[PDB]
Short mmCIF file of C-alpha atoms and ligand atoms in Angstrom, two decimals:
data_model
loop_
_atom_site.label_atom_id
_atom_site.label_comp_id
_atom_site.label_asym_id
_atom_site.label_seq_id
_atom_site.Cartn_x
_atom_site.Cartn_y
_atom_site.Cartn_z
CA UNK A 1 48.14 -11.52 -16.56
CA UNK A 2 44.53 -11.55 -16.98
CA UNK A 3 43.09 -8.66 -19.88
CA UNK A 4 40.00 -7.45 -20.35
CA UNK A 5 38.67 -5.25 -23.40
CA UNK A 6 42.29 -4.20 -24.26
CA UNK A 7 43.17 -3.44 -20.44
CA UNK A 8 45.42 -5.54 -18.25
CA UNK A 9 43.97 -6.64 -15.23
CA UNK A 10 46.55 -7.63 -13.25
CA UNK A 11 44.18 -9.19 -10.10
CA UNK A 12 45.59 -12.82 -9.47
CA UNK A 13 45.86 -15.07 -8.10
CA UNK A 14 42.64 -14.45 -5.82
CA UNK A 15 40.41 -13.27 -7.80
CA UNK A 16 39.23 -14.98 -11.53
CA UNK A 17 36.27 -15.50 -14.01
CA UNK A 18 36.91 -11.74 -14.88
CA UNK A 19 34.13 -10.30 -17.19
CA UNK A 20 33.55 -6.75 -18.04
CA UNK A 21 31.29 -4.63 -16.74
CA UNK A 22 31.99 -1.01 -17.61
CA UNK A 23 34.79 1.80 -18.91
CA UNK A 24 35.95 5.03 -17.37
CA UNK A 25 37.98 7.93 -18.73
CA UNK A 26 40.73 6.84 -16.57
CA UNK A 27 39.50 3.44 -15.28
CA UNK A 28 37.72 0.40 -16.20
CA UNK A 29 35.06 -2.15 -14.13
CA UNK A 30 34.93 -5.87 -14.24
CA UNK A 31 33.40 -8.38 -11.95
CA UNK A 32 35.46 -11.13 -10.64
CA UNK A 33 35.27 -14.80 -8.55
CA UNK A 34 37.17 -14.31 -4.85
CA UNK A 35 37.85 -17.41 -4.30
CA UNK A 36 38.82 -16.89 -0.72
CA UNK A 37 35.34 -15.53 0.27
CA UNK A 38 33.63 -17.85 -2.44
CA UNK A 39 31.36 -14.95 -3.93
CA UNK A 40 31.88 -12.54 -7.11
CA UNK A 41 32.66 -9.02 -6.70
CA UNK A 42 33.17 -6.05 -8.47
CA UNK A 43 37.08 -5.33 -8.98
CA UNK A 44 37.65 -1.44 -10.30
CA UNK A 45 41.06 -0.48 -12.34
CA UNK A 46 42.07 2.88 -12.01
CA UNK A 47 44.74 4.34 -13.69
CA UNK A 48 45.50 7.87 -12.72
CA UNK A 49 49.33 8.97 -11.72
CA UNK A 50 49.85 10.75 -15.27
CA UNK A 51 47.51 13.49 -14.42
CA UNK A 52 47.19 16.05 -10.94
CA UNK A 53 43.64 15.68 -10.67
CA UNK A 54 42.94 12.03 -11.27
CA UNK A 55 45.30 11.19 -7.83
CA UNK A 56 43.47 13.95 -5.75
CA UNK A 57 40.30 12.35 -6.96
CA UNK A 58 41.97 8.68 -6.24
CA UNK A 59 43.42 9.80 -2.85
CA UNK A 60 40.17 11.36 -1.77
CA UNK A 61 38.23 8.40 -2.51
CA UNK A 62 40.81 5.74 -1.11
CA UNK A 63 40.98 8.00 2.32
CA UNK A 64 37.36 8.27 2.96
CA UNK A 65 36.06 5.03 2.14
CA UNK A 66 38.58 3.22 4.15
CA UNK A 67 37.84 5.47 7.31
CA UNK A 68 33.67 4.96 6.92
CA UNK A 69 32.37 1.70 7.62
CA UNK A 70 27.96 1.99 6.89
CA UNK A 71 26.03 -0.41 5.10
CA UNK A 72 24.59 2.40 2.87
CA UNK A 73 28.27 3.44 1.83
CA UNK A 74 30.59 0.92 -0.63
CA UNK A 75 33.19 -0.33 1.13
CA UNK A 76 36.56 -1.28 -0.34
CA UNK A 77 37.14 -4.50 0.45
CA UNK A 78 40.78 -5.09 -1.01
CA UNK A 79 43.34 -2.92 -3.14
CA UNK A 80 45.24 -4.58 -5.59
CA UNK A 81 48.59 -2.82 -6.25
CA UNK A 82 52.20 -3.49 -7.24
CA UNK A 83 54.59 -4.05 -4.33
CA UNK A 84 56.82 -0.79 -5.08
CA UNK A 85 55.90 3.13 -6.01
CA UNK A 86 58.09 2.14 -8.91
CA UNK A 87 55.92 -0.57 -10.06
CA UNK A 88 52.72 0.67 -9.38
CA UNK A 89 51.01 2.05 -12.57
CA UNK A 90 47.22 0.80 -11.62
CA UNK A 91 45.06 0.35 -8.30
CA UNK A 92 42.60 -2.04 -8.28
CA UNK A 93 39.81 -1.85 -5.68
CA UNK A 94 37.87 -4.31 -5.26
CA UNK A 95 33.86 -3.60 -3.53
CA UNK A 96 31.15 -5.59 -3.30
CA UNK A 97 29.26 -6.89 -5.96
CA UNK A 98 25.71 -4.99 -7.35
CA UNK A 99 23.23 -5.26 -9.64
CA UNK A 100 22.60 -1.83 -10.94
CA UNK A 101 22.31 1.61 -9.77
CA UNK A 102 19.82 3.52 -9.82
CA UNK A 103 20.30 5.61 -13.04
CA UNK A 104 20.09 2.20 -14.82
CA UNK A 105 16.84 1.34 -12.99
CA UNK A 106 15.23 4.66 -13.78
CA UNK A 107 16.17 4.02 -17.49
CA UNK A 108 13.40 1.21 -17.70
CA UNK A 109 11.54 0.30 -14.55
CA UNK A 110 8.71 2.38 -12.81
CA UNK A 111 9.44 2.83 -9.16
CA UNK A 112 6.49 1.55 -6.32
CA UNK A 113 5.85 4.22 -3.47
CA UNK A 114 7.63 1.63 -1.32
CA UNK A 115 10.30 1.21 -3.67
CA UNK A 116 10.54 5.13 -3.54
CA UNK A 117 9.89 5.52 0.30
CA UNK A 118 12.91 2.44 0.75
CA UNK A 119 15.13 4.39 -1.96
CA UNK A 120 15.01 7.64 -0.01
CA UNK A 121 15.28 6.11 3.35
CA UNK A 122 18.82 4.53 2.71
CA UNK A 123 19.95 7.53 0.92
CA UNK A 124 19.71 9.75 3.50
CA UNK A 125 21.18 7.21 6.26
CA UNK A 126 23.91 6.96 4.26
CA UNK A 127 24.23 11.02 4.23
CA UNK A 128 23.35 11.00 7.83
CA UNK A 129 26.79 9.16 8.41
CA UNK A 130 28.64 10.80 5.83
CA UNK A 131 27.66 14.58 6.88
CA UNK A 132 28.22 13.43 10.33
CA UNK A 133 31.81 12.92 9.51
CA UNK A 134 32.08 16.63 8.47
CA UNK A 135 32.09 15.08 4.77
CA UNK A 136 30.45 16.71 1.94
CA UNK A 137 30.15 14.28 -0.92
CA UNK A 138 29.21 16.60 -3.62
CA UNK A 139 28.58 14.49 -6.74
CA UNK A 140 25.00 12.77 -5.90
CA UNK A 141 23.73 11.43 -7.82
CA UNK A 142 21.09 8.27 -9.91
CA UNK A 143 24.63 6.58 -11.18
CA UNK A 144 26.16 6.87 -7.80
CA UNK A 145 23.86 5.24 -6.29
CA UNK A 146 24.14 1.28 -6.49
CA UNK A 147 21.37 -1.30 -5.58
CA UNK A 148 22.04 -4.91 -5.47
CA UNK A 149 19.32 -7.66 -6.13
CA UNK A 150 17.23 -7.37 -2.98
CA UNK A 151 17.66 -3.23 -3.36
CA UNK A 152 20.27 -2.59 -1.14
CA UNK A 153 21.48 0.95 -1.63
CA UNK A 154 24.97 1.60 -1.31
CA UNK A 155 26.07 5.65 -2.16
CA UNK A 156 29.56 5.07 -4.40
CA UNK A 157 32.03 7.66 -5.64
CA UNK A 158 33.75 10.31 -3.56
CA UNK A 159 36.58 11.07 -5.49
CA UNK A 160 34.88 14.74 -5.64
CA UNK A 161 33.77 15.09 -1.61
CA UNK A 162 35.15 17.80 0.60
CA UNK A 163 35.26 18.65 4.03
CA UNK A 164 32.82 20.75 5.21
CA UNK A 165 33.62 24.53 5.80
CA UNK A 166 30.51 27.08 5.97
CA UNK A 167 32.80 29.87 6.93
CA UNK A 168 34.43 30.04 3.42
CA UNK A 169 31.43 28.97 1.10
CA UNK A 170 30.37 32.60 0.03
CA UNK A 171 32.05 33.32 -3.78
CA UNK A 172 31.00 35.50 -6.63
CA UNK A 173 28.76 34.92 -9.59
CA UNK A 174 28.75 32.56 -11.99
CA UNK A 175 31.71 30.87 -10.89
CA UNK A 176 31.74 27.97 -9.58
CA UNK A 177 31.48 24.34 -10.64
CA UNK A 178 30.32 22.00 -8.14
CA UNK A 179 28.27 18.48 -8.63
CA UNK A 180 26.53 17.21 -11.98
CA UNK A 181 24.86 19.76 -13.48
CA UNK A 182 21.32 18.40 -13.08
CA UNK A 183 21.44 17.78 -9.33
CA UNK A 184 23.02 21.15 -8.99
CA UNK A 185 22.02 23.36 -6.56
CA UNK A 186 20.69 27.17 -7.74
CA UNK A 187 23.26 28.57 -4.79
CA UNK A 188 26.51 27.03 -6.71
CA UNK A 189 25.56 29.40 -9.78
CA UNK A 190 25.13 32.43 -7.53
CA UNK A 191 27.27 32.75 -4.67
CA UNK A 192 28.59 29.69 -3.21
CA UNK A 193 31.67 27.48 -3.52
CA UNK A 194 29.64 24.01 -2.12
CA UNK A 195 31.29 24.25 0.80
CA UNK A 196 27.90 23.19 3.05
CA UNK A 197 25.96 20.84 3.44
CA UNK A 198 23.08 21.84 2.09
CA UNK A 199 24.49 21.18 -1.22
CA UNK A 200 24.00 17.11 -0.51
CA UNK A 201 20.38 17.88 0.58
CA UNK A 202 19.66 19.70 -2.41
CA UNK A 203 21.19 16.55 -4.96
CA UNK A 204 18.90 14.46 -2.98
CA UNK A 205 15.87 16.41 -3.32
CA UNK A 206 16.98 16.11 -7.09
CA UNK A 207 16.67 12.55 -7.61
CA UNK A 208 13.71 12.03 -5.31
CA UNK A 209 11.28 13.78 -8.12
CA UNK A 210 13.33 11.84 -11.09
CA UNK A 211 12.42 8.75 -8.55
CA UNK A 212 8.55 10.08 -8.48
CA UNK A 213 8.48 10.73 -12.67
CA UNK A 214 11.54 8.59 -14.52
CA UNK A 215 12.60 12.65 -15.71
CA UNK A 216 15.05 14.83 -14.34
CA UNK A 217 13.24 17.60 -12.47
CA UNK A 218 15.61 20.47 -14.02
CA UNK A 219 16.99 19.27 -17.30
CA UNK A 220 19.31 22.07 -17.84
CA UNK A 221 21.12 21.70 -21.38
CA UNK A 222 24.61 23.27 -19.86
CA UNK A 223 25.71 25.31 -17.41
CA UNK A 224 23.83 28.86 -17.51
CA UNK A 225 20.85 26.88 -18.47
CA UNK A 226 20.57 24.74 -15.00
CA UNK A 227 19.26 27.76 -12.74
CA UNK A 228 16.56 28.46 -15.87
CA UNK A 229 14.98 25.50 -14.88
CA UNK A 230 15.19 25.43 -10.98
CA UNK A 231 13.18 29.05 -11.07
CA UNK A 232 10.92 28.20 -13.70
CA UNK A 233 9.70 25.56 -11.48
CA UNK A 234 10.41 26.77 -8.03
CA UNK A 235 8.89 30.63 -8.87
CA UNK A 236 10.76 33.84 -8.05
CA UNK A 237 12.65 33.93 -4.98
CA UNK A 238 11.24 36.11 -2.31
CA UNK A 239 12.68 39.04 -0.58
CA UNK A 240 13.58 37.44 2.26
CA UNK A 241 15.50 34.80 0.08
CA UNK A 242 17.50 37.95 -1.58
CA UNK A 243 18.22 39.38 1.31
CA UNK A 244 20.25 36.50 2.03
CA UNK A 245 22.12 36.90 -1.12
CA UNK A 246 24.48 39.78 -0.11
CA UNK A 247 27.08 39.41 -3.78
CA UNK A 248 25.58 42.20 -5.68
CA UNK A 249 25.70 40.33 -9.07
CA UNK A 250 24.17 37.83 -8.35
CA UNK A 251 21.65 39.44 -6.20
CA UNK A 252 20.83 41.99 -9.01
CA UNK A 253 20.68 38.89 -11.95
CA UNK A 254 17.52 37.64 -10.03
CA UNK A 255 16.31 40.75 -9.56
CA UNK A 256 16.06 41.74 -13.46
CA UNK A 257 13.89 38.47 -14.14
CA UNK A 258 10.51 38.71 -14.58
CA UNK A 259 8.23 36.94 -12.55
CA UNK A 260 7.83 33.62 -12.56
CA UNK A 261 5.00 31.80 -9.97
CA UNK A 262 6.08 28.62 -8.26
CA UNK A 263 4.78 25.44 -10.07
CA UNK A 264 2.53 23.50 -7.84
CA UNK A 265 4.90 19.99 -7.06
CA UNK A 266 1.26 18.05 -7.21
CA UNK A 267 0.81 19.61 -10.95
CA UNK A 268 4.13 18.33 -11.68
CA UNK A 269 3.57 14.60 -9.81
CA UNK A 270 -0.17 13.68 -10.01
CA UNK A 271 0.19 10.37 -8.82
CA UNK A 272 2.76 11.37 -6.15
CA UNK A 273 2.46 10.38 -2.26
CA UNK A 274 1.59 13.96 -0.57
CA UNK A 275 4.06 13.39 2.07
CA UNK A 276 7.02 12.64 -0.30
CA UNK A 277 5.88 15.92 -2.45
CA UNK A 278 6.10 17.88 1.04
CA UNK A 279 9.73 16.56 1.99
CA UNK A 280 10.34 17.20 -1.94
CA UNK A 281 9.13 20.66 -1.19
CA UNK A 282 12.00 20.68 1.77
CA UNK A 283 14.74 19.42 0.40
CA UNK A 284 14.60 21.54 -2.97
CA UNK A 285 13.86 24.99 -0.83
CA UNK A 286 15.66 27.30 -2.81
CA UNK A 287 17.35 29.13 0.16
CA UNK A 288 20.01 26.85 1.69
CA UNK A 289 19.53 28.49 4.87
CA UNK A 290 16.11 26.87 4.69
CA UNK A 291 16.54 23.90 3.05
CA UNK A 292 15.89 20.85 5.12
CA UNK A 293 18.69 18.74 6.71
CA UNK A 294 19.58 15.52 6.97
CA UNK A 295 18.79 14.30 10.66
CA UNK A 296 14.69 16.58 9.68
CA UNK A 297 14.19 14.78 6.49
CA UNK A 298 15.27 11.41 7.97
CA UNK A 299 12.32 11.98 10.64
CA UNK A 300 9.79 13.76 8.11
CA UNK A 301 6.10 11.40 8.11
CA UNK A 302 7.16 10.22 4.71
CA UNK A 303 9.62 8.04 6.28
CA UNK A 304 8.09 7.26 9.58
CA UNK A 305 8.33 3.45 8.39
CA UNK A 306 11.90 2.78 8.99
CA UNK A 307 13.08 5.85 10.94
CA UNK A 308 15.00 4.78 13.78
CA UNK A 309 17.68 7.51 14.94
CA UNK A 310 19.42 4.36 17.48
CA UNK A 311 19.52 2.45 13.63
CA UNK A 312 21.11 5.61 12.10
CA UNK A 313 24.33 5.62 12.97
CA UNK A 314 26.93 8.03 12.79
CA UNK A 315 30.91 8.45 12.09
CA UNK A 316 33.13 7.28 15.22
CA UNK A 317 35.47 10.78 14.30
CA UNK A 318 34.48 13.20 12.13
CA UNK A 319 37.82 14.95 9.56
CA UNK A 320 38.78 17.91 11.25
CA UNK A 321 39.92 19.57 8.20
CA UNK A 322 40.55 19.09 4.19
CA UNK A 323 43.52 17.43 3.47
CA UNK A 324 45.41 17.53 -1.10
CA UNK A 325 45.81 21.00 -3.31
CA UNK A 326 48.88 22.06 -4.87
CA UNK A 327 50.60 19.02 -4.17
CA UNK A 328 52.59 17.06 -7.66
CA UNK A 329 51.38 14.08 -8.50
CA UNK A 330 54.85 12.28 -7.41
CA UNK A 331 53.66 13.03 -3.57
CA UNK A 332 49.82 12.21 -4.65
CA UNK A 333 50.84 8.62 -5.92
CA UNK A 334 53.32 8.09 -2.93
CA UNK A 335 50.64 9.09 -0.80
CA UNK A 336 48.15 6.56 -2.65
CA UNK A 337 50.61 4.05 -2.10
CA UNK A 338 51.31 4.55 1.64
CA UNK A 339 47.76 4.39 2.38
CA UNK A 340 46.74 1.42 0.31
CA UNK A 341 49.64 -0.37 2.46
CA UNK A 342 47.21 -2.35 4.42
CA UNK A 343 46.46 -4.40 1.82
CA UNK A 344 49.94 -5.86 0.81
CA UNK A 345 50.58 -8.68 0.13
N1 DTW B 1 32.68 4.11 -14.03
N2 DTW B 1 32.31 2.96 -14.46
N3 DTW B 1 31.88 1.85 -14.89
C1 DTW B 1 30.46 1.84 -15.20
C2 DTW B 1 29.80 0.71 -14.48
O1 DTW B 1 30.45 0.42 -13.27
C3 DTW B 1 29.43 -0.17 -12.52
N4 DTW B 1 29.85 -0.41 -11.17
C4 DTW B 1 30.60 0.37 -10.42
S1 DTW B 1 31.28 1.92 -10.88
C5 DTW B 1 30.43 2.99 -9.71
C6 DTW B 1 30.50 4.46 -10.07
C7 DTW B 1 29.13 4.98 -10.43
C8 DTW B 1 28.83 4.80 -11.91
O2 DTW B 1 29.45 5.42 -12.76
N5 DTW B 1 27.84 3.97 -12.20
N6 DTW B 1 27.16 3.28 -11.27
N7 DTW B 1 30.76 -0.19 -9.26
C9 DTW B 1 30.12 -1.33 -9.26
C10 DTW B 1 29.94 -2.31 -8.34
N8 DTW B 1 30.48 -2.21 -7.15
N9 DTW B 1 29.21 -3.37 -8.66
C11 DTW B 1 28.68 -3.49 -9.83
N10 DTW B 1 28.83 -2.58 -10.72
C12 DTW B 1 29.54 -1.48 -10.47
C13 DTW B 1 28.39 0.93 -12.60
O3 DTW B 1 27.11 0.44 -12.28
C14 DTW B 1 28.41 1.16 -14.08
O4 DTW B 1 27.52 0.22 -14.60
#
């Protein structure tokens, strides 16, 4: 067997020329020759039936990625496994092949408007899909977004989605722990579980101003510090907005800040295209009720380039309900086995 960095990579025989790419706290990335199809590709190892949460995470992703078929979503392409529960102690799936994403990109390279405009586009087409399937992805963001040499953006990574469920998002205050923290949106701190889609919308708006500037719009230095910097720059939320906000706590927290006046997005992105600042303006509305979705931003003038709504397809059946919980991680691994059976031998 083939190692890597310390790892075994147990991929043969169709797959060789293994060089590493990157490292996980569970997993590890290498890209790899398939010599059926003749190309390279990107082979993850993921090692996760010691611990609960690492097979939910493993199951989640396996389940949804095989079931969506989009060309702005990775696809697996093959799972690499042992040929018995007893012998499996990895899963290796194997994607396509990219370049970067776009956390690396923002790192070093200043975007065009058309790079931007192109970005944004295939982002939310790829959410279009995904929302349409009842799905909530719930971690977007830069890193989870890969681009491949001609800038081809694939959304990656939903060992962390849900399915959708408005009816049960309301919680208390301070409480929950959705998404990475700087794409977080301010309702998640306040009064809701992330149950909605909305939350997606809001990750988006997110990383369309780090697109615009190369800086996180809210750089919030932990937890309680992310909603400091969504109102210093979004202004005191109106009555209207409070009166949304029925959870007392959380209602009465904004109400014993001072006030703070809503920072002008143009003051913030001189060199900006006006029509991406307005759908920036949408999409990072602090009320979800508000907040723009999907199928609007998709037709907002910003993107009148490529919007297409016959090109924009959506999911053939939607998942009626979330899958899963309480379950050990004997019945999570048997379950990761069962449906990575396609792929055998
Ligand atoms: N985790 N990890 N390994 C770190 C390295 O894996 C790279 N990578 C990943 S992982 C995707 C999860 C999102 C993330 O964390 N970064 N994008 N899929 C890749 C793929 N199909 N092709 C090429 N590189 C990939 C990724 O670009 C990062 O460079």
């Amino acid at each position: 067997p083939e190692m890597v960095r310390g790892q075994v990579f147990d991929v043969g025989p169709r797959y060789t020329n293994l060089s590493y790419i990157g490292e996980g706290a569970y997993g590890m990335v290498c890209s790899a020759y398939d010599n059926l199809n003749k190309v390279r590709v990107a082979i993850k190892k993921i090692s996760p039936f010691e611990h609960q949460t690492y097979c939910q995470r493993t199951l989640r992703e396996i389940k949804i990625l095989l079931r969506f078929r989009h060309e702005n979503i990775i696809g697996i392409n093959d799972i690499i496994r042992a040929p018995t529960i007893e012998q499996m102690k990895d899963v290796y799936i194997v994607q396509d092949l990219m370049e970067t994403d776009l956390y690396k990109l923002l790192k070093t390279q200043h975007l065009s408007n058309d790079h931007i405009c192109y970005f944004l586009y295939q982002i939310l087409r790829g959410l279009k899909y995904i929302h349409s399937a009842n799905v909530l992805h719930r971690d977007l963001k830069p890193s989870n977004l890969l681009l491949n040499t001609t800038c081809d953006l694939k959304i990656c990574d939903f060992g962390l989605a849900r399915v959708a469920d408005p009816d049960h998002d309301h919680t208390g205050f301070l409480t929950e722990y959705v998404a990475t923290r700087w794409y977080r949106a301010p309702e998640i701190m306040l009064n809701s579980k992330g149950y909605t889609k909305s939350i997606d919308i809001w990750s988006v708006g997110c990383i369309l101003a780090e697109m615009l500037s190369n800086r996180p719009i809210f750089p919030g230095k932990h937890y309680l510090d992310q909603l400091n910097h969504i109102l210093g720059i979004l202004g005191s939320p109106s009555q209207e907005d409070l009166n949304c906000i029925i959870n007392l706590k959380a209602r009465n927290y904004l109400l014993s800040l001072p006030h703070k006046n809503k920072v002008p997005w143009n003051r913030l992105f001189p060199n900006a295209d006006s029509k991406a600042l307005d759908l920036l303006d949408k999409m990072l509305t602090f009320n979800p009720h508000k907040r723009i979705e999907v199928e609007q931003a998709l037709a907002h003038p910003y993107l009148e380039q490529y919007y297409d709504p016959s090109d924009e397809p959506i999911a053939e059946a939607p998942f009626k309900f979330d899958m899963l919980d309480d379950l050990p991680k004997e019945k999570l691994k048997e379950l990761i086995f069962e449906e990575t059976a396609r792929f055998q031998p």
